[PDB]
Amino acid sequence: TRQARRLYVGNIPFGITEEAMMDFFNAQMRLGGLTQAPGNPVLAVQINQDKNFAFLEFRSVDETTQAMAFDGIIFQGQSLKIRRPHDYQPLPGMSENPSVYVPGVVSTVVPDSAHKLFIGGLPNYLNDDQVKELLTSFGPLKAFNLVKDSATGLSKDYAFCEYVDINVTDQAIAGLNGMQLGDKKLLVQRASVGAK
RNA sequence: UUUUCC
């Protein structure tokens, strides 16, 4: 069951320790009401600092599945990218999708879709949390990801998002498209317009 | 200025 008891966590804060990450996830699991017993659901964390990802190992298949609901949670300003291991395949009797919804957690999986938005020209000093806040001002988000350099972790100055209410899409465009900030000017438009 | 092991 081990492949079904581990998760990839990407975009982790620079310099974070394995025990700091374990404490964070154990606390979040209990605060969200996802822990299915006394004691810690997360048994171990293994971090690769050079490449900036971690793998979490859980005591339970079901608690592993519930933890998928934390995808996008902000940790020291960064959107944690929670994913299955690539060699995971659902088991018999187990369900692969989370039973729960953690309030305020915004998924990082933003599928191409009608009202998926592109936001370009962002100031380079804004982190995942601040950019998400910029967009949440117009309405609650269904999904969001700020694109970062895979080696340095620095922002690439563009993001994608999807609002819960499809009608907020045009309000966010009207509020943000063409806004000038120094050298740069925001481009905010449905991502299909400028995609390849 | 179209999301990264054992």
Short mmCIF file of C-alpha atoms (C1' of nucleotides) in Angstrom, two decimals:
data_model
loop_
_atom_site.label_atom_id
_atom_site.label_comp_id
_atom_site.label_asym_id
_atom_site.label_seq_id
_atom_site.Cartn_x
_atom_site.Cartn_y
_atom_site.Cartn_z
CA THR A 1 0.00 0.00 0.00
CA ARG A 2 3.05 2.24 0.15
CA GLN A 3 2.53 3.80 -3.29
CA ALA A 4 -0.95 4.66 -1.97
CA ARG A 5 0.46 6.22 1.22
CA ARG A 6 2.81 8.86 -0.22
CA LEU A 7 2.38 12.23 -1.91
CA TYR A 8 4.57 14.60 -3.89
CA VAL A 9 4.71 18.16 -2.57
CA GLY A 10 6.24 20.74 -4.92
CA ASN A 11 7.13 24.43 -4.67
CA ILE A 12 8.21 24.04 -1.04
CA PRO A 13 9.78 26.98 0.85
CA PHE A 14 13.55 27.28 0.45
CA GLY A 15 15.45 25.98 3.46
CA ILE A 16 12.47 24.23 5.05
CA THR A 17 13.36 21.26 7.24
CA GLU A 18 11.79 17.82 7.04
CA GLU A 19 10.43 18.16 10.58
CA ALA A 20 9.03 21.65 9.95
CA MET A 21 7.18 20.27 6.93
CA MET A 22 5.91 17.28 8.92
CA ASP A 23 4.70 19.51 11.76
CA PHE A 24 2.93 21.79 9.28
CA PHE A 25 1.02 18.99 7.57
CA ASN A 26 0.15 17.17 10.79
CA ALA A 27 -1.25 20.41 12.22
CA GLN A 28 -3.16 21.27 9.05
CA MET A 29 -4.65 17.77 8.88
CA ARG A 30 -5.92 18.05 12.43
CA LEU A 31 -7.13 21.66 12.08
CA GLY A 32 -9.06 20.74 8.93
CA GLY A 33 -10.77 17.78 10.55
CA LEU A 34 -9.11 15.28 8.20
CA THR A 35 -7.19 13.16 10.72
CA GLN A 36 -9.02 9.87 11.28
CA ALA A 37 -7.52 9.03 14.70
CA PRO A 38 -5.29 10.27 17.54
CA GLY A 39 -1.66 10.77 16.59
CA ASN A 40 0.11 12.08 13.52
CA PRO A 41 -1.16 11.06 10.06
CA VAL A 42 2.21 12.05 8.50
CA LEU A 43 4.98 9.62 9.46
CA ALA A 44 7.92 11.00 7.46
CA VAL A 45 9.00 13.70 5.03
CA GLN A 46 11.90 13.44 2.57
CA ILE A 47 13.10 16.72 1.05
CA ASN A 48 15.27 17.39 -2.02
CA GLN A 49 16.52 20.96 -1.54
CA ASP A 50 18.33 21.24 -4.88
CA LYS A 51 15.06 20.52 -6.72
CA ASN A 52 12.63 21.98 -4.14
CA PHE A 53 10.14 19.16 -3.62
CA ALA A 54 9.24 16.75 -0.85
CA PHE A 55 7.54 13.39 -0.48
CA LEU A 56 5.22 12.80 2.47
CA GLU A 57 4.55 9.32 3.84
CA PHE A 58 1.28 8.72 5.71
CA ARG A 59 0.17 6.01 8.10
CA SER A 60 -3.10 5.47 6.19
CA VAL A 61 -4.30 5.12 2.60
CA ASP A 62 -7.44 7.12 3.36
CA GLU A 63 -5.60 9.92 5.16
CA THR A 64 -3.27 10.12 2.16
CA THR A 65 -6.28 10.56 -0.10
CA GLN A 66 -7.80 13.22 2.17
CA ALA A 67 -4.49 15.12 2.16
CA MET A 68 -4.89 15.63 -1.59
CA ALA A 69 -7.48 18.25 -0.58
CA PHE A 70 -4.65 20.50 0.65
CA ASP A 71 -3.32 21.09 -2.87
CA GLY A 72 -2.65 24.83 -3.09
CA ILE A 73 -2.35 25.47 0.65
CA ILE A 74 -0.05 28.41 1.36
CA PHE A 75 3.09 27.61 3.37
CA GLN A 76 5.48 30.49 4.08
CA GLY A 77 3.90 32.36 1.19
CA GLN A 78 4.11 29.53 -1.36
CA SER A 79 1.35 27.48 -2.98
CA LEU A 80 2.18 23.86 -2.19
CA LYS A 81 1.64 21.63 -5.23
CA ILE A 82 0.25 18.32 -3.92
CA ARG A 83 0.18 15.44 -6.41
CA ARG A 84 0.12 11.66 -6.46
CA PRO A 85 3.42 9.85 -7.08
CA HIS A 86 3.65 9.14 -10.79
CA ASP A 87 3.70 5.36 -10.16
CA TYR A 88 0.51 5.46 -8.07
CA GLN A 89 -2.53 3.57 -9.31
CA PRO A 90 -5.78 3.28 -7.33
CA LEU A 91 -6.23 0.11 -5.27
CA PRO A 92 -9.33 -2.10 -4.99
CA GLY A 93 -11.80 -0.85 -2.40
CA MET A 94 -10.00 2.48 -1.96
CA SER A 95 -11.23 5.70 -3.53
CA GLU A 96 -8.63 7.98 -5.12
CA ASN A 97 -10.40 11.36 -4.74
CA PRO A 98 -10.70 13.45 -1.56
CA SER A 99 -13.93 13.19 0.41
CA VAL A 100 -13.37 16.64 1.91
CA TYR A 101 -13.08 20.30 1.02
CA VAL A 102 -10.74 22.45 3.13
CA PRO A 103 -12.19 25.98 3.41
CA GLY A 104 -10.09 28.65 1.74
CA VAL A 105 -7.65 26.26 0.07
CA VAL A 106 -7.45 27.02 -3.66
CA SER A 107 -6.32 24.17 -5.92
CA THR A 108 -3.22 24.66 -8.10
CA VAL A 109 -4.65 22.50 -10.93
CA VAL A 110 -5.96 25.04 -13.47
CA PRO A 111 -7.21 23.10 -16.53
CA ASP A 112 -7.50 24.87 -19.85
CA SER A 113 -11.15 25.93 -20.01
CA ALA A 114 -13.46 28.67 -21.22
CA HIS A 115 -12.82 31.18 -18.43
CA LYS A 116 -9.31 30.23 -17.36
CA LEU A 117 -7.45 33.54 -17.09
CA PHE A 118 -3.89 34.57 -17.91
CA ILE A 119 -2.36 37.35 -15.80
CA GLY A 120 0.90 38.70 -17.16
CA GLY A 121 3.26 41.53 -16.30
CA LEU A 122 3.17 40.98 -12.55
CA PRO A 123 5.88 42.63 -10.41
CA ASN A 124 8.62 40.12 -9.76
CA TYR A 125 8.62 40.56 -5.97
CA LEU A 126 5.05 39.27 -5.48
CA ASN A 127 4.87 35.74 -4.09
CA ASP A 128 2.14 33.13 -4.64
CA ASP A 129 0.14 34.41 -1.68
CA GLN A 130 0.19 38.07 -2.72
CA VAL A 131 -0.77 37.32 -6.31
CA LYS A 132 -3.60 35.07 -5.15
CA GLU A 133 -4.76 37.87 -2.85
CA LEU A 134 -4.72 40.31 -5.78
CA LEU A 135 -7.11 38.03 -7.66
CA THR A 136 -9.28 36.99 -4.69
CA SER A 137 -10.22 40.65 -4.31
CA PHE A 138 -12.60 40.22 -7.28
CA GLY A 139 -14.08 36.96 -5.97
CA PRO A 140 -13.29 33.50 -4.62
CA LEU A 141 -10.99 31.38 -6.76
CA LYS A 142 -11.51 27.80 -7.88
CA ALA A 143 -7.88 27.36 -8.94
CA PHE A 144 -4.69 29.39 -9.20
CA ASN A 145 -1.02 28.98 -10.06
CA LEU A 146 1.82 31.51 -10.25
CA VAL A 147 4.55 30.35 -12.62
CA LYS A 148 8.05 30.24 -11.14
CA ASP A 149 11.52 29.45 -12.44
CA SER A 150 12.11 25.75 -11.80
CA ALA A 151 15.71 26.28 -10.64
CA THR A 152 15.69 29.60 -8.77
CA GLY A 153 12.11 29.68 -7.48
CA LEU A 154 11.78 33.27 -8.64
CA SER A 155 8.48 34.33 -10.14
CA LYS A 156 8.25 34.45 -13.92
CA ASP A 157 5.73 37.31 -13.56
CA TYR A 158 2.66 35.53 -14.91
CA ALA A 159 -0.09 33.41 -13.41
CA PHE A 160 -3.27 31.54 -14.34
CA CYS A 161 -6.52 31.28 -12.46
CA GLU A 162 -10.17 30.24 -12.54
CA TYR A 163 -12.89 31.95 -10.52
CA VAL A 164 -15.66 30.03 -8.80
CA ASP A 165 -18.22 32.33 -10.47
CA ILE A 166 -17.59 32.40 -14.21
CA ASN A 167 -19.02 35.94 -14.25
CA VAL A 168 -16.20 37.27 -12.06
CA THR A 169 -13.83 36.56 -14.98
CA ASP A 170 -14.84 39.71 -16.85
CA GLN A 171 -14.86 41.82 -13.67
CA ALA A 172 -11.24 40.83 -13.00
CA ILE A 173 -10.29 41.63 -16.61
CA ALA A 174 -11.97 45.03 -16.35
CA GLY A 175 -10.28 45.75 -13.03
CA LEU A 176 -6.76 44.62 -13.92
CA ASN A 177 -6.12 44.51 -17.68
CA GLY A 178 -3.83 47.32 -18.77
CA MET A 179 -3.00 48.48 -15.24
CA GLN A 180 0.44 50.09 -15.36
CA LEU A 181 2.99 49.54 -12.60
CA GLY A 182 6.35 51.08 -13.46
CA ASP A 183 8.14 49.27 -16.26
CA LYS A 184 5.25 46.90 -16.84
CA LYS A 185 1.57 46.78 -17.69
CA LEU A 186 -0.70 43.93 -16.72
CA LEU A 187 -2.16 41.78 -19.47
CA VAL A 188 -5.29 40.05 -18.15
CA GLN A 189 -7.30 37.99 -20.62
CA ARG A 190 -8.69 34.49 -21.00
CA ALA A 191 -5.69 32.20 -21.39
CA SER A 192 -7.01 30.74 -24.64
CA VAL A 193 -6.49 34.09 -26.35
CA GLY A 194 -2.68 34.01 -26.16
CA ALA A 195 -1.87 30.34 -25.61
CA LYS A 196 0.09 28.25 -28.09
"C1'" U B 1 3.95 38.78 -20.26
"C1'" U B 2 1.15 31.35 -21.83
"C1'" U B 3 2.80 24.32 -12.33
"C1'" U B 4 9.33 21.07 -10.87
"C1'" C B 5 11.73 10.89 -5.06
"C1'" C B 6 11.70 6.13 -2.87
#
